[PDB]
Amino acid sequence: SAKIVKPNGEKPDEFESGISQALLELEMNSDLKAQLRELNITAAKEIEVGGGRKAIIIFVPVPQLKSFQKIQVRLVRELEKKFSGKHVVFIAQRRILPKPTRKKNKQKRPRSRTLTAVHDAILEDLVFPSEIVGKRIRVKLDGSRLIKVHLDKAQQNNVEHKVETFSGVYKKLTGKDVNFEFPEFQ
């Protein structure tokens, strides 16, 4: 199988040729080759979400992430059309660096490579057509904390059915749980 668009660490292409092939007959399409041949993906997951629903996550290099962000809605529309019954999200590959403890000549860890910043950026990239307008993290009496994220109320018609997939994906690849709301206009 032609796997030309998937750079990796070195090796792993774990039967996820489906996304590469799908992009490959998203070749010869309408007005999408001016902005798709030069940029590619790193990895893809087919995690379980909610009930029997399935969502697929696509990991992208960061400058290539911004270049996906400019054309994401069209590509995700027909790629969901091909992969019927599943939801597609685009996430960067973010490279968290560990916190330096008291244990040769290491460099200063960038603030964007911290886990807090990475989780914030992941939450921002996960919901792309809508914009985050607030955060209402709440400690519920047990030491456990639930995050509540407010979306921009201008893409509610576009994205209101994916919120449980967003919650499942964010629980899967970050570990904490979120809810999504659409407040009245500010």
């Binding site: 607030g134 955060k135 209402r136 709440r138 400690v139 009496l141 030491g143």
Partner: protein, 129 residues
């Protein structure tokens, strides 16, 4: 000009609890404030609380229960050994039956019963009863 955010947070909690109010807005937020509130909330003295994220230092809206008397702070963080914890317990707490001293130790921010359980000392943050 505001040298201590924990002092102002606990003063606001104390004043609004004495006024009989049901919620408090704590204006500058920090994780020391959150750990102190988590100790206070695990011991049953306050209710739920919610952190409001603006891209500056946040804000906290705390739900009060009516079970709080005094939640003051100790203004220099005096370093406390396990030998001297009894002295601080007698000076600060109303009895030997209830009330907690919140220390910060290398094992985390915790009350004094847990600090004696885990055989550690630290710097004293404050008290509540």
């Amino acid at each position: 000009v505001r040298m201590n955010v924990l002092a102002d947070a606990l003063k606001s909690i104390n004043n609004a609890e004495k006024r009989g109010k049901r919620q408090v807005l704590i204006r500058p937020c920090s994780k020391v404030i959150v750990r102190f509130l988590t100790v206070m909330m695990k011991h049953g003295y306050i209710g739920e609380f919610e952190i409001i994220d603006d891209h500056r230092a946040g804000k906290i809206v705390v739900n009060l229960t009516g079970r709080l008397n005094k939640c003051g702070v100790i203004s220099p963080r005096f370093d406390v050994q396990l030998k001297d914890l009894e002295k601080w317990q007698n000076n600060l707490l109303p009895s030997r039956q209830f009330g907690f001293i919140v220390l910060t130790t290398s094992a985390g921010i915790m009350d004094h019963e847990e600090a004696r359980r885990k055989h550690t000392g630290g710097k004293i943050l404050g008290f509540f009863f």
